[PDB]
């Protein structure tokens, strides 16, 4: 089965704890709901389930959207957001990609 | 902003299949009824009980739910039966196709 890559971070509780001193403009509660926990090295976060890691968050970027764009394969992402959400993010990026540059 | 069924008489699925008795066309009658449609009599004309959107000339491969969302995305029945994402996907898909098919 598609097993949780970090079982010790499966609980939301364990995840927000890592964001104790969060100086970055991306909301820590959003990140943790989206499966992420902080590493303690800048804004580096990682998904507890797929292990996908992300840094250098721009102030406006969305945790669930980023999760779906970079790591669409995540099972935690699938059972939380569903197929249509995931495919939606990718379609949108392709459309944008294609409209800009004509 | 009231958004109530345009033909409240056709709200029950059972009322809608009943209209398909002599259905002789490519597209599945249960799939049509399920999507909110009922037959009018004339040809392969169907209308959604809720939005009043009407459709004819069904190709054999075409999906009731998809066509409903493509043509009449505003329907409340469609929304609460399939959800925002579904509806917005059909549209995004069509925009991407058209866009790509150019160069
Ligand atoms: C919210 C996403 C942001 N807009 C973005 O695009 N970030 C990128 C990113 O996070 N990564 C891509 C490249 C950098 C990008 C920004 N400069 C590759 C994957 C990720 C990244 O840097 N991930 C790692 C990593 C660091 C060094 C070597 C290999 C992988 C990472 C590891 C652990 C925890 C977090 C991130
Ligand atoms: C799954 C639909 C099929 N692939 C399609 O594209 N059908 C179109 C369609 O149903 N309509 C579009 C144009 C014809 C197309 C068929 N060549 C316009 C809207 C719809 C249509 O014919 N709607 C009406 C209608 C309005 C004015 C005059 C004649 C028909 C309609 C009325 C009653 C019952 C069904 C449809
Ligand atoms: Zn993940
Ligand atoms: Zn409708």
């Amino acid at each position: 089965t598609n097993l949780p890559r970090n079982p010790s971070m499966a609980d939301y509780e364990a995840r927000i704890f890592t964001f104790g001193t969060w100086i970055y403009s991306v909301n820590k509660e959003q990140l943790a709901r989206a499966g992420f926990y902080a590493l303690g090295e800048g804004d580096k976060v990682k998904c507890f389930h797929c292990g996908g890691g992300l840094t250098d968050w721009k102030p406006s970027e969305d945790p669930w959207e980023q999760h779906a764009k970079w790591y669409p394969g995540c099972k935690y992402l699938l059972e939380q957001k569903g197929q249509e959400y995931i495919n939606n993010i990718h379609l949108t990026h392709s459309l944008e990609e294609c409209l800009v540059r004509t």
Side-chain angles (χ1 to χ4, degrees), chain A residues 22-54:
Chain A
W22 195 248
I23 71 155
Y24 306 95
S25 64
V26 169
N27 180 279
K28 42 158 180 153
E29 278 81 22
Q30 267 168 240
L31 290 154
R33 278 174 173 100
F36 297 110
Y37 57 89
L39 299 201
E41 195 186 328
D43 61 4
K44 286 197 187 185
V45 299
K46 212 163 170 64
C47 178
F48 84 90
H49 195 280
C50 63
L54 266 5

Side-chain angles (χ1 to χ4, degrees), chain A residues 49 74-83 86:
Chain A
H49 195 280
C74 187
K75 176 173 182 174
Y76 178 74
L77 175 67
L78 182 61
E79 295 182 305
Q80 293 291 299
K81 301 300 284 206
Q83 306 172 160
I86 295 155

Side-chain angles (χ1 to χ4, degrees), chain A residues 63-100:
Chain A
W64 273 133
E65 293 181 5
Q66 291 315 296
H67 203 157
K69 182 192 163 194
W70 294 86
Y71 314 103
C74 187
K75 176 173 182 174
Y76 178 74
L77 175 67
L78 182 61
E79 295 182 305
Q80 293 291 299
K81 301 300 284 206
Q83 306 172 160
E84 327 259 27
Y85 178 92
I86 295 155
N87 296 332
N88 191 24
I89 299 311
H90 287 268
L91 281 185
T92 307
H93 287 260
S94 299
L95 216 217
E96 195 268 359
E97 178 267 322
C98 189
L99 286 172
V100 170

